[PDB]
Design a protein around this ligand. Structure first.
Ligand SMILES: CN[C@H]1CO[C@@H]2OC[C@H](OC(=O)N[C@@H](Cc3ccccc3)[C@H](O)CN(CC(C)C)S(=O)(=O)c3ccc(OC)cc3)[C@@H]21
Lengths: 99, 99
């Protein structure tokens, strides 16, 4: 699709068998999801933004369906105030910014 | 242009006659610039992000060039980790997300 930016670019995702709403975020290097369970091993990570840093769990090789497009990559899980799809998965669905 | 997301979507902006680097950020409602001097009166705003809130100064009807495109609109000034061009100005330059 072509997504205008008058409103937040929110989409439905499927992750870990669960449907969630998430923000398509070109300013995010990484994908950050609210607390949930994911399979496999994880390692701790700190991610920083406006406000400071939060501690997350890093899961590698996670499959997400993003507005119907499958992508695999790293997902960070922790106390984000919004689910964020970052560039590490936006590239895999072919997303570009155009003007 | 068409901006892919394999790298951060960094562009040059011009504000107050000065060139700065900024991130094109679809996840940002608002445009936030590092401490600098802007003309006129300001209003208070709290901005929430991944790791809590920051206080900023809100300046309205500021002239800013973004990757060669003229915009005139609200700029928040404060302790952002990076200059962010949010949707309020991305809509003025005609940016869309496409996949
Ligand atoms: C609610 N208020 C926010 C929304 O609109 C306002 O505009 C400014 C601020 O927006 C944000 O902080 N937006 C976040 C994304 C965002 C969105 C909403 C809440 C939290 C975060 C942004 O798009 C992505 N981030 C960083 C930029 C600040 C550099 S981040 O969430 O901190 C982030 C950092 C590192 C990551 O990987 C290393 C992945 C994500 C305000």
């Amino acid at each position: 699709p072509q997504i205008t930016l008058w409103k937040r670019p929110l989409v439905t995702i499927k992750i870990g068998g669960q449907l969630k709403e998430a923000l398509l975020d070109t300013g995010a290097d990484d994908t950050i999801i609210e607390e949930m369970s994911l399979p496999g091993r994880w390692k701790p990570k700190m991610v920083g933004g406006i406000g400071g840093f939060i501690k997350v769990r890093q899961y590698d090789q996670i499959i997400i369906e993003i507005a119907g497009h499958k992508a695999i990559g790293t997902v960070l899980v922790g106390p984000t105030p919004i689910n964020i799809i970052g560039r590490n998965l936006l590239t895999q669905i072919g997303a570009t910014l155009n003007f």
